[PDB]
Amino acid sequence: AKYYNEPCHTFNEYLLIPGLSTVDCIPSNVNLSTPLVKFQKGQQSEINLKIPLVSAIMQSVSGEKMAIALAREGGISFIFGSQSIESQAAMVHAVKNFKAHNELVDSQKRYLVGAGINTRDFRERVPALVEAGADVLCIDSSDGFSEWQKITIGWIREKYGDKVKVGAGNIVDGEGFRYLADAGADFIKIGIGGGSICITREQKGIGRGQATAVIDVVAERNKYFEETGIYIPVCSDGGIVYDYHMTLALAMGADFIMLGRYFARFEESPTRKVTINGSVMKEYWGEGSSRARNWFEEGVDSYVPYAGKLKDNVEASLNKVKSTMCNCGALTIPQLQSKAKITLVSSVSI
Amino acid sequence: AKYYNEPCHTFNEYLLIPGLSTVDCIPSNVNLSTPLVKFQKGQQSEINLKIPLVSAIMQSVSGEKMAIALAREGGISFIFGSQSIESQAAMVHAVKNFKAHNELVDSQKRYLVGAGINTRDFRERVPALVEAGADVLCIDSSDGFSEWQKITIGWIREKYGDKVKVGAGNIVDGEGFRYLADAGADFIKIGIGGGSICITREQKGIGRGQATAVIDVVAERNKYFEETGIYIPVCSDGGIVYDYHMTLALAMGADFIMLGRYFARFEESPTRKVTINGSVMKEYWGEGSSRARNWFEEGVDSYVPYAGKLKDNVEASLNKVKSTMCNCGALTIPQLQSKAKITLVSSVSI
Amino acid sequence: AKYYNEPCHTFNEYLLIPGLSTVDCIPSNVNLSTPLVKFQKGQQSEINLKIPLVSAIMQSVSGEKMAIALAREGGISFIFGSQSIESQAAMVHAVKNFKAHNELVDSQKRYLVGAGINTRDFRERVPALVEAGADVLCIDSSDGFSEWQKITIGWIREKYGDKVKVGAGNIVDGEGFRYLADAGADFIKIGIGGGSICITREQKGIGRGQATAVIDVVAERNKYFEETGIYIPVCSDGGIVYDYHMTLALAMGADFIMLGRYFARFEESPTRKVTINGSVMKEYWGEGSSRARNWFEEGVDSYVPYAGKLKDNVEASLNKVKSTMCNCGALTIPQLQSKAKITLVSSVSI
Amino acid sequence: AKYYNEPCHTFNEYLLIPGLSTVDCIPSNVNLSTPLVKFQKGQQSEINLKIPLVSAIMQSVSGEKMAIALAREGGISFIFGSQSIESQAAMVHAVKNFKAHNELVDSQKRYLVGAGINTRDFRERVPALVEAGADVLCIDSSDGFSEWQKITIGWIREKYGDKVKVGAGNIVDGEGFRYLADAGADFIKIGIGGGSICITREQKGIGRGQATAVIDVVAERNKYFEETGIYIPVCSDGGIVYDYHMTLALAMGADFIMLGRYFARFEESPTRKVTINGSVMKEYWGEGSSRARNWFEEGVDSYVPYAGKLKDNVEASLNKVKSTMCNCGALTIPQLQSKAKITLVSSVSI
Numbered sequence A, B, C, D: 001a002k003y004y005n006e007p008c009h010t011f012n013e014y015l016l017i018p019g020l021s022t023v024d025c026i027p028s029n030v031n032l033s034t035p036l037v038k039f040q041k042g043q044q045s046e047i048n049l050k051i052p053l054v055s056a057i058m059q060s061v062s063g064e065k066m067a068i069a070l071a072r073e074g075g076i077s078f079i080f081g082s083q084s085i086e087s088q089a090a091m092v093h094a095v096k097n098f099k100a101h102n103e104l105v106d107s108q109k110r111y112l113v114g115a116g117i118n119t120r121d122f123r124e125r126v127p128a129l130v131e132a133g134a135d136v137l138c139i140d141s142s143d144g145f146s147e148w149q150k151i152t153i154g155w156i157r158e159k160y161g162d163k164v165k166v167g168a169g170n171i172v173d174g175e176g177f178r179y180l181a182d183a184g185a186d187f188i189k190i191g192i193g194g195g196s197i198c199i200t201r202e203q204k205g206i207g208r209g210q211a212t213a214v215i216d217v218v219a220e221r222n223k224y225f226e227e228t229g230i231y232i233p234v235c236s237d238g239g240i241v242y243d244y245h246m247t248l249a250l251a252m253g254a255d256f257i258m259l260g261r262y263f264a265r266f267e268e269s270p271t272r273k274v275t276i277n278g279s280v281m282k283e284y285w286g287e288g289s290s291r292a293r294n295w296f297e298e299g300v301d302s303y304v305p306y307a308g309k310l311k312d313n314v315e316a317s318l319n320k321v322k323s324t325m326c327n328c329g330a331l332t333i334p335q336l337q338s339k340a341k342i343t344l345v346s347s348v349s350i
């Protein structure tokens, strides 16, 4: 077997050391724009998010309302694919034709929306999603280092060329990144075992500390860019517990962040608002739980504290990210990724 | 004294990083067959388990019923030797003559069964076990790095040559492995202080994290194979807390796994089913406890939650191992041992 | 991004290993004098504290009474700047004209006092503080690695040359130290995220273990001294939980220590003494809490156990520091910084 | 300041890896004899303990009864010196003239006894202790790296030459060992901050993990032996929590072990047996507590569970040490120190 020289680490084991803050760096001047799909050196991505946040491909998170609320703030949602093809396509259609400053829209001013797909019924699901107006797709899986994903992306390329965008994953190392890169993925998702609803050491024992995963994948992505001239955006998926973890994820190189629990707490999540013993909560369950996979166990069902509407919470979260970015001397995500000083902290200090 | 460069680690400190999963790797096609006794390069072992699990040499685990239930699923039990020679032999006889898809049997279609022996009364115990039809023997001890085990194996070779198989142990490093290898052991057991009923730092303070122990012994076993052409199967004994620890143990190189607590929870364990305050439990005590050694203290007595019949639980456990194996791109244990990517995780992440 | 080879550590992760204690080293002969502002090689600082302790630039700590009580024992207070310019100047005036063995005074025998300033209204605040008789100033900020601090210090130099002393900070590495050094700071404060009222991983996630921060800054300060002949005193700000942390901070190279919580517990702190359920406590809130910044959240409000008058507590604390210094063979802070043997301890031992 | 490459570790962070156990190694044949005072290469120590245990120089541990009970089993007690010279000498006299298989006695068959001394009144205390019949003395201090100890040992040599034996300490590194060695100490005690009644990080913050301390001192002692031909026995003082820590301490190189809490639990300790809420306990306080030093605070007062008479407990403890020694292939302490395989374990495994 193959072993590693260092153990993996989570976001909580890191802190950012401030850099030179110049007079021009104030929150309001920080640009959080970021690329969603791959492009060549010298080019710009065909799709750029206004904010680096995307909602998870989960039944309990990304419904039509979430997609609209998030797109309005500049991010994008990936309508869950764990439902009928007709049902998912309807949600995409609804978002695209809802209108019939930081909003994320297409050339027709329609909100952008993404849709998750699987490696099984894609031949019938993809065409339906495309027809419905899906702007981007993403294969939804915990282990994306699979020949099945290569096959799915291949079918999409043969049928649509580079006209249809498709993200792939999840993977946690350079090899996994490289495989999906050569297979043609437009963006690659990072993360196995870091999700809030994931108790890896109770499931199959696969995974890697999210921080180490991102750092390793990002290094491979940059090496890949230098060899081929192709820049593939990467997504840090799961493990975001505090707002500063967002800044860390981006600083380590992730172009954008996928969150489930964070967004489930909002009014716009498709789940029921349940007042439990004085405290308002919201339902939240993983895609691996029986409560969802049937559309030993493989998931968990829980509650998250109600946080109100998405808007106010995202604004608050991003204000802190912008502020921290200025402490690090960065006005943009690329500048933060270049200038960030990231230190590991001792277990005792935690 | 001699010191080491790195501290030892337990199975809980590791996770498997996925490799390339091909279209042909699905649970039902995974082969969990594995060698039980030594053979030369180019050969196959005279005894191959259908599943890599064996029940512990304990009064509270491996009785006649356990041996039959486990052999039916492809594994093998080691009837405890902490009882009279006549009593142990009777259990072996019963298993061998019980019949008078994955079942483990001999050329006469009789279930395979093993028997534990000690370094004291083996001159009278071994012949009785052989006559009773024991398929394999195993010296039962916490510290197998002993001249006593060399003597016992030697007596067996002089009297039966290589016709009678005998495992030895336990040891935790290359030196211990090497000593029992040269002494003639057919398989070597790994593990001191990792058992669930073992509070080393309350006993004699001897031991080593199970993971480090396996990794070190496996490296020595492979070095030994390359020097002599002799492949000696090794057994990871104790410390299995979760199903994924099984996959880890195998991935690190262990050919099979010995479990006590895991099997004690089943209907077939020779202990009493005790309903305690609404919850059904089963008795479980170590071979070092006074409740067993008399056939300061040196053991513990406890209860384990009832899990029902062995069959359903083993099937469930092995389905997860097979699934994880496919995530790692492996259709067989040898392929998993060759391709596994194993990472240590930080203490904080735990 | 830039990463580090070692994780950062807090004061609690260190212990001092005794050195040779000579017959002349007894507590009463230990000299705790220390420089407050920069000087050139061969010179002495224009301002030397009698004891290496200074009270924090906080509304809940450094008021007029604190400043007088601390100056009487040899230390100095930095009147908080989070109040009106007129209000802060009045406190400075009161301390300077209060008299109208270890006391810290000027050539006119008036108690020394410091005053915090900000990077915004300094053009009006500084002149008022100077006129009021402030002996030293200090820019109050969590992230001193800012062009804003360079601008503030520059304005002070152009208007007063080196006649007005101004400390800057906070920073946590050599780069941050170097920037404020070249900018002209008279002393530099070390520390981000180590304060007792700081939950970094709930704010912006910036910071560094206080110990590592001091050690790193001190190395840069000594390198700087060797290149330019300029010795800049550094202050370890925050994170002092036990008296021995004081000895550690000094041993690692800090010239003096800034404390908030430690001093808040005293009768002289400007807060209310609140008897809560039998125990007398004192109010303590951070400068980032809403309860103070308005003169999502950015601070905490709490209570600290009443410790009585400053005098008896400081004497007790410093007696232990002096005693420990003799164990390390040191009669002065510079000798301790030169001879200290500092070891990291394992997480398990904690 | 000076820093170290590795953090210090306690005994709990180590485990012994078994070595080859030969047929002749059984508990009853294990020899636990060990040297108490220094000798030259090729020689034997003038005083050899039958068992490597000595009771602490504490009012709550080593009284006349303890000294007799321990000497009867082969160890020796150091009558506490924190009492009047007349009072301490009386206890020594009583032990020496109490008679007016493993017993530790002199050529006149009188029990051996030790006595603690301080660096202040030794000119009057030593002669009184010698006259009373003290077999060995030991300077009692937490920081033995002192010119005061050099002075005390020097006075003893000038007045008695090498006729009076005197141990010194405590120290925790090679430098401290070396200083007391050159000063003439007959044995050196190791340990600062490891005692059970020591909360270092609440006192002065001085110390070092006991394990690292012993390992480091032992290396220096062996280097010293090779340079000068003088072998100085070293004592691991404090930190023994479990019986196996004894085996560890010896394996790491300590010739003998000093224990306080361990012996306080016995009927023979000079403290009161207090039945508290059904459980019989014994008083135990440190020499630094006010309850003893007057013959801020510097010690703790507590209770230890009653263990009965010393004899049965020591026999039990040493049987486990002997058994563990055989697992390591050692029949004597020197052989264990030479053959022991010692591994550090991960924090997670603890």
Ligand SMILES: O=c1[nH]cnc2c1ncn2[C@@H]1O[C@H](COP(=O)(O)O)[C@@H](O)[C@H]1O
Residues within 6 Å of the ligand: A056, A057, A058, A191, A194, A195, A196, A197, A198, A199, A237, A238, A239, A240, A258, A259, A260, A261, A262, A285, A286, A287, A288, A289, A298, A299, A300
């Ligand atoms: O049932 C599940 N088990 C484990 N991970 C899951 C499950 N469902 C979703 N996830 C992952 O967890 C992410 C959400 O992480 P969270 O933001 O920490 O809640 C998703 O985007 C998925 O990648």
Ligand SMILES: O=c1[nH]cnc2c1ncn2[C@@H]1O[C@H](COP(=O)(O)O)[C@@H](O)[C@H]1O
Residues within 6 Å of the ligand: B056, B057, B058, B191, B194, B195, B196, B197, B198, B199, B237, B238, B239, B240, B258, B259, B260, B261, B262, B285, B286, B287, B288, B289, B298, B299, B300
């Ligand atoms: O009394 C005992 N003390 C320590 N280890 C024991 C004892 N009895 C059995 N064992 C070991 O523990 C293993 C079982 O580990 P478990 O599966 O974690 O319960 C056995 O196969 C033995 O090697």
Ligand SMILES: O=c1[nH]cnc2c1ncn2[C@@H]1O[C@H](COP(=O)(O)O)[C@@H](O)[C@H]1O
Residues within 6 Å of the ligand: C056, C057, C058, C191, C194, C195, C196, C197, C198, C199, C237, C238, C239, C240, C258, C259, C260, C261, C262, C285, C286, C287, C288, C289, C298, C299, C300
């Ligand atoms: O609101 C706050 N948040 C974080 N740090 C603060 C705040 N107010 C003051 N500080 C810092 O904490 C120090 C006090 O640390 P303490 O002595 O551990 O209580 C101050 O000198 C500041 O540098």
Ligand SMILES: O=c1[nH]cnc2c1ncn2[C@@H]1O[C@H](COP(=O)(O)O)[C@@H](O)[C@H]1O
Residues within 6 Å of the ligand: D056, D057, D058, D191, D194, D195, D196, D197, D198, D199, D237, D238, D239, D240, D258, D259, D260, D261, D262, D285, D286, D287, D288, D289, D298, D299, D300
């Ligand atoms: O008051 C005290 N504070 C700290 N250490 C002490 C005190 N009194 C005795 N000791 C040390 O603690 C040892 C006992 O350690 P114990 O066996 O762990 O209880 C003694 O031999 C001394 O070296």
Ligand SMILES: [K+]
Residues within 6 Å of the ligand: A018, A019, A020, A021, A326, A327, A328, A329, C143, C144, C145, C146
């Ligand atoms: K900055």
Ligand SMILES: [K+]
Residues within 6 Å of the ligand: A143, A144, A145, A146, B018, B019, B020, B021, B326, B327, B328, B329
């Ligand atoms: K895979």
Ligand SMILES: [K+]
Residues within 6 Å of the ligand: C018, C019, C020, C021, C326, C327, C328, C329, D143, D144, D145, D146
């Ligand atoms: K000293």
Ligand SMILES: [K+]
Residues within 6 Å of the ligand: B143, B144, B145, B146, D018, D019, D020, D021, D326, D327, D328, D329
């Ligand atoms: K052995």
